[PDB]
Design a protein around this nucleic acid. Structure first.
Lengths: 114, 120, 56, 121, 209
RNA sequence: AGGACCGAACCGACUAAUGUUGAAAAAUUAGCGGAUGACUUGUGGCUGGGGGUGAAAGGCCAAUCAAACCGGGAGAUAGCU
RNA sequence: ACACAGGUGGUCAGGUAGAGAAUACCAAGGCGCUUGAGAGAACUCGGGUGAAGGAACUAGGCAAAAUGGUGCCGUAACUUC
RNA sequence: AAUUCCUUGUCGGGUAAGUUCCGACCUGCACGAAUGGCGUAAUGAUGGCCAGGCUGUCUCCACCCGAGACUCAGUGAAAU
RNA sequence: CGAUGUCGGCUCAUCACAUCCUGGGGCUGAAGUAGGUCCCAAGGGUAUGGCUGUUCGCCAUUUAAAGUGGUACGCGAGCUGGGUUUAGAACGUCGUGAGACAGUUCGGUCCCUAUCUGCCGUGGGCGCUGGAGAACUGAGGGGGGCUGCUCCUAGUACGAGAGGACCGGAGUGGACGCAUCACUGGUGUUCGGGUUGUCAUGCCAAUGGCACUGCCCGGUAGCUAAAUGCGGAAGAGAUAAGUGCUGAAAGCAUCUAAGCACGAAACUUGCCCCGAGAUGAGUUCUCCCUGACCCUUUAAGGGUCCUGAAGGAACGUUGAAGACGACGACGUUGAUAGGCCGGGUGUGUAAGCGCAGCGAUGCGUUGAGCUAACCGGUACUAAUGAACCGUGAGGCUUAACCU
């Protein structure tokens, strides 16, 4: 309705950086073991969703030690403190599930006056 | 179930539905008033009226889209030359449905679907 | 599956109690030609509400 | 994870492919794959591993293709299903070194040793 | 305690600073104006009748119009009743009503569940399908045995068979209120409440809590 | 060269599902076997009932087979219903 | 028995892809199978696609899923070579 | 053993678990040499078992697409 | 015996209590932990696999427990046909032989369109006493009643040590049930794109058909589970085995006879759903109708004319309601559907033109172009004014009240 997309708009953060799928983004999430909170870095290739409002998300994949760990993180969650775009990769599909599922096969980078 | 779902299956597959709506829209553009059963007319509004909303803007890509739908170049030419200027100020509702009598062969609710500013 | 005893003509009538047709109960009369038509339907001479909508 | 599920082994002493014969904990528990303990047979083993083929002992699932759901709605999916082998009576890790990622869901009781040994939490 | 009537306006999230992402259902509670109070003299019980929303006054029938005109004229989409154990309410309306839910911490939400039509046994109850591939002449999701030969000679009354699911009243209890926003006239409740979007819901303070 | 191999026409009929008051008094739809031969098919002919024919199953001999069908003995007989 | 989803010998054999009389799309040519119109419950039939597990199903991998072509490497235990 | 009642005999093997399977032992109710005895490459819409791939077989079902089923018009049976 | 289908498994159950778990107790050769045995108690719960056709049984691993029996050894007009239990074949044994076996092995067709009762859902007529629209009271009926582990009490009580509380608390699960789609996903033949083969639109380009949606890759709404919220309670009444107080019979004594207080997941309430057809048809609020004549076999009636009220019904646009009825929203005093405008979403830089390149192709325009079932607006199209049904003040007896 109208009262949602006002309630959701007041929770959304307006500092989200812009990044297409295929990029390699580093996100800083808060881990709270005790009373202490520290930032944790997750870098990997992205298979994104476009902005569904507050209910938005990105999944990144990283091959740590032969095991591909895949994290969906909510865009406007307070856990994700910062997103850094880093490398920008030229892809032709919005969802890169096939291009992530293989091992040793990586998203290429093309910069045609990007 | 059928919850918040649109489209009428009309007891045919999707290829037959698209083929009937192409032929039907071509017939409506050519004759400007046709007799068809009432559910088919209600679903015909959703295929004829987008073509006229396309035809309000005359461009090569728009002619190609209105050819890709309905695959009849005479219907494309009528849509872009004759209609369009016929419906340019009009904001929707190019097609009007008048319920008519039941079909004799089978008791089907029938109707007449026509373009609104038909001369006669 | 099959009946075990034969149903009565009474049971036939009680079942057919709801197979009774419904009359129209109201036939609309058009303004510009007073002929009767089904409501929300054309007059079978070609008129809807006050105008000749179909020539045939 | 489920019964008749093959899993890789994170730890060194546990060897290669293992199969879940029973989902421990619960009367009719069908599927358990986050921090749960499952009874394990060793379907195929290398000789350097201490355990051997045909041996039943417990394990804890550390990686699941289904993945955990975080409180904010985040889903960490790990490719491959993995277990850390545990003794039947003690439920303590046989392997001295854990390999691959682990989740913060395995932070309770004896799994603290697993997240201590494993590199990425 | 008395309850209010709202229209469900959907579901969303409230992201706490910790990161809990509380899943909430937003309920639009307008001013619920009291139409009638019933006591132990004229009636047998203590209640207030409540109207909310607006109606076009063309669809308001004359009996309902006279009912509204007696004891404070108002236009409302419906009448719902709430019984009082102890409270005393006047026959004029409440100007702001959602504020009684600010102090409460758990609520019960009652609504008409979304209709699923003629629903099978496998959908309706959690009945198990017979094995598809091994033989199984035409008995995949069908009900199996419904009885026990001659000695009952009948099927019992509480038998779980196919039928309608939905369009029926259900209550969901002990739901945490997240935030009561009075000027926006919203009641945010943790979790999922019955109804489709737009349906009338009666929300009451928790009987268990 | 091949009672060779894969496989259409063709011949057959291994499994399954549907049908079982069927579309059909044994079929349909997916798969299956053989497919230059002990193969297959058209047209005639020959073998006749306690007889024929049978790479044999009591199989087949006109939707009929541990002795076909049709008429006669025949209104057989029936301590049985 | 039917305007019956079956049976019925022979002849002709276009283009493109293709080994092909497979198969796909079409020539020439012929048809929409003599009840329709709606809605879009259960359930049945015929399909498509499924997180994670994967034969735990079951009398049994029944059924589905799977593999599939050419060229070139390579390729055993036993053998009647 | 296409044969062994007791019997799911006993040893080795395969599985977490194996009345099935394989190699056997010989205590063969009640094998045995053209009513053939024993092996045997190839072959089999043959019987039994194991494994890999593969999956709605299953955990545990879900959505969608068509023909019925439901409603309306015409024709209009059956067993009992 | 003019036909009651056989074990077993699948699906679905229901009852008894001779109670497996959970609950309450007594004795203990009961220190604690853990037991044995007996009494009360049916509310709920009461495994997955290897083998075999198996119920069984044995085995692996669970669990609080993996109850025992009845229900045509429950259940084949519900499913299966592995088994016995036909017709083919073989082995062992018997018989000269045909064949046989309270032996073995391989193969071997499981029909039904529901009349009646019964259940599960959903409606028409009439009743309920003038007719309507709504809100209810609750007589009854149904649902739901499971339980593990960790911690605090507390290493306290108890104990030679070893060990170690079966009161009272808090958290977190397994199983089950309900709702929902905000997240995570699944589907998404009605969105976008890639691409094989062919045909067509004259042709290049761009498209469309067909090949399972041709094969895919993603995917909106909706539905959904594997996703998320919640619940089985607390309490009160009366109790059962049991435990008592006072207390005679029977000067003591005694739980009982007079009295009195405890006591369980059982019973009645408490929570959730239906529910006045509850013929015992109930209550409250509000609305609407107060004109004549004729005949009469007058507790009573029949008819005529005028009048049609509140309201319902119909018709149309329809729905997150729905098999059909039914239910809900709207009908020009209009946002009810489609269309239209804007946005969101999804796909991934369309066509055309230009440039580079021998060419495939690349680059720019360009995160472009299409885009659904979504959100917010807008009368452009269809929801016409009628017409129909329903009437015109509501029986008879008796009480507080007034003539």
């Amino acid at each position: 309705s109208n009262i949602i997309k006002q309630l959701e708009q007041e929770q959304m953060k307006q500092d989200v950086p812009s990044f297409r799928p295929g990029d390699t983004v580093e996100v800083k999430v808060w881990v709270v073991e005790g009373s202490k909170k520290r930032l944790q870095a997750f870098e990997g290739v992205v298979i994104a969703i476009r902005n569904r409002g507050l209910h938005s998300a990105f999944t990144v994949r990283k091959i740590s030690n032969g095991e591909g760990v895949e994290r969906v993180f909510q865009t406007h969650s307070p856990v994700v403190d910062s997103i850094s775009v880093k490398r920008r990769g030229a892809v032709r599909k919005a969802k890169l599930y096939y291009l992530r599922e293989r091992t040793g096969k990586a998203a290429r980078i093309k910069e045609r006056l990007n | 179930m059928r919850h918040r779902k649109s489209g009428r299956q009309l007891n045919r597959n999707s290829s037959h539905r698209q083929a009937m709506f192409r032929n039907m829209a071509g017939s409506l553009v050519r004759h400007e008033i046709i007799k068809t059963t009432l559910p088919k007319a209600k679903e015909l509004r959703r295929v004829v009226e987008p073509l006229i909303t396309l035809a309000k803007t005359d461009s090569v890509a728009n002619r190609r889209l209105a050819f890709a739908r309905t695959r009849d170049n005479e219907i494309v030419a009528k849509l872009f030359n004759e209609l369009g200027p016929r419906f340019a100020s009009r904001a929707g509702g190019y097609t009007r449905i008048l319920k008519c009598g039941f079909r004799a062969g089978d008791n089907a609710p029938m109707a007449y679907i026509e373009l609104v500013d038909r001369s006669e | 599956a099959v009946q075990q005893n034969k149903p009565t003509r009474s049971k036939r009538g009680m079942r057919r109690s709801h197979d009774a047709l419904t009359a129209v109960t109201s036939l609309s009369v058009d303004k510009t030609s007073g002929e009767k038509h089904l409501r929300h339907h054309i007059t079978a001479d070609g008129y809807y509400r006050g105008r000749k909508v179909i020539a045939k | 994870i489920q019964e008749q599920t093959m899993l890789n082994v994170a730890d060194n002493s546990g060897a290669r492919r293992v199969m879940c014969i029973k989902v421990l904990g619960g009367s009719h528990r069908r599927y358990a794959g986050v921090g749960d303990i499952i009874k394990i047979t060793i379907k195929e083993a290398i000789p350097r591993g201490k355990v051997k083929k045909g041996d039943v002992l417990k394990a804890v699932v550390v990686r699941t293709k289904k993945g955990v759901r975080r409180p904010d709605g985040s889903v960490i999916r790990f490719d491959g299903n993995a277990c850390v082998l545990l003794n039947n009576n003690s439920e303590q890790p046989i392997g001295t070194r854990i390999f691959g990622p682990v989740t913060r869901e395995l932070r309770s009781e004896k799994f603290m040793k697993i997240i201590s040994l494993a590199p990425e939490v | 305690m008395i309850g209010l009537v709202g229209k469900k306006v959907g579901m969303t999230r409230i992201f706490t600073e910790d990161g809990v992402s509380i899943p909430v259902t937003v309920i639009e509670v307008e001013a619920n104006r009291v139409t009638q109070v019933k006591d132990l003299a004229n009636d047998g019980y203590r209640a207030i009748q409540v109207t909310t929303g607006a109606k076009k006054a063309n669809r308001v029938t004359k009996p309902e119009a006279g009912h509204f005109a007696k004891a404070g004229v108002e236009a409302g989409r419906g009448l719902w009743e709430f019984r009082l154990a102890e409270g005393e309410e006047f026959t004029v309306g409440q100007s702001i009503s959602v504020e009684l839910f600010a102090d409460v911490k758990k609520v019960d939400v009652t609504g008409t569940s979304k209709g699923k039509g003629f629903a099978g046994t496998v959908k309706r109850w959690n009945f198990r399908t017979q094995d598809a591939t091994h033989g199984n002449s035409l008995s995949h999701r069908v009900p199996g045995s419904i009885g026990q030969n001659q000695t009952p000679g009948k099927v019992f009354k509480g038998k779980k068979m196919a039928g309608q699911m939905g369009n029926e009243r259900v209550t969901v209890q002990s739901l945490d209120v997240v935030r009561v926003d009075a000027e926006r006239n919203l009641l945010l409740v943790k979790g999922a409440v019955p109804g489709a979007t737009g349906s009338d819901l009666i929300v009451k303070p928790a009987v268990k809590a």
